[PDB]
Every structure is written in structure tokens, then in C-alpha cells.
Amino acid sequence: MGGQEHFYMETQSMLVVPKGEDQEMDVYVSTQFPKYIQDIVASTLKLPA
Amino acid sequence: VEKFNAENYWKKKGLAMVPLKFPVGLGSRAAGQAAALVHIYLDGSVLVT
Incomplete structure (x- = not known):
């Protein structure tokens, strides 16, 4: 039996925005x-959650 | 200061002392209500607001 592509109509998309204080990220x-x-x-930034 | 002022016509000193009772409180119980929200993430770090 063969596989299958998800083919969600929205491709993978993100915006990562650093706040500029205390290494805060909004994702x-x-x-x-x-x-x-x-x-x-x-983990990647070595930051608390 | 009294000594100074007896010896100086164009320059005077002065001294004063005032006490403080500053009462604190709002009109109603409802005006003093307050709320917070606390999360603990699985790494143990805490977000409060």
C-alpha cells in the first residue's frame, strides 16, 4: 500500500518575532x-518556556 | 537658625517640622478587588500576570 501527501492547501508557514526584552519570542x-x-x-534558544 | 537670623539682615534661615497621617483605602470593597493568572509550564518556569 502506497503513501499519501497531506496536501493541506496552506503550505508550511510561520512568523517568528523577537520582542527585544528578556529574549522573549512570539511565534x-x-x-x-x-x-x-x-x-x-x-530548547533551541536555551530559554525557559 | 535664631542665632543666624539675629546676625544676618539680607539672608535668613528657617526650620519647620510637619507630621503625616496618610489614610489608605477606597470607597468600597468592590473597588479594592484584584485578580491574577498563574501558569506553570512543564519545564517548571512560571508566567504570572
């Missing part, structure tokens, strides 16, 4: 799992 992203986005971004 606007087309995702199903914000808590996971928060984790991987914080």
Missing part, C-alpha cells in the same frame, strides 16, 4: 501543537 505558526513549538524553540 505565529500554522501548527497542530503549540506546546511542542514552545518547547523546541525554547
Whole structure:
């Protein structure tokens, strides 16, 4: 049995905006799992959640 | 200061002391109500507002 492309009509999209204070990031992203986005971004920046 | 002022015609000193009772409180119980929101993320860090 063959695979299948998701083919969501909106392609992968995000905007990452640093606030400029305390290394605060705001992440606007087309995702199903914000808590996971928060984790991987914080980990990558060595920041608390 | 009394000594100074007896010896100086064109320059005077003065001294004063005032007490303070500053009462604190609003008109009603409802005016003093207050609220907060606290999250603990899974890395243990805290966001408060």
C-alpha cells in the first residue's frame, strides 16, 4: 500500500518575532501543537518556556 | 537658625517640622478587588500576570 501527501492547501508557514526584552519570542505558526513549538524553540534558544 | 537670623539682615534661615497621617483605602470593597493568572509550564518556569 502506497503513501499519501497531506496536501493541506496552506503550505508550511510561520512568523517568528523577537520582542527585544528578556529574549522573549512570539511565534505565529500554522501548527497542530503549540506546546511542542514552545518547547523546541525554547530548547533551541536555551530559554525557559 | 535664631542665632543666624539675629546676625544676618539680607539672608535668613528657617526650620519647620510637619507630621503625616496618610489614610489608605477606597470607597468600597468592590473597588479594592484584584485578580491574577498563574501558569506553570512543564519545564517548571512560571508566567504570572
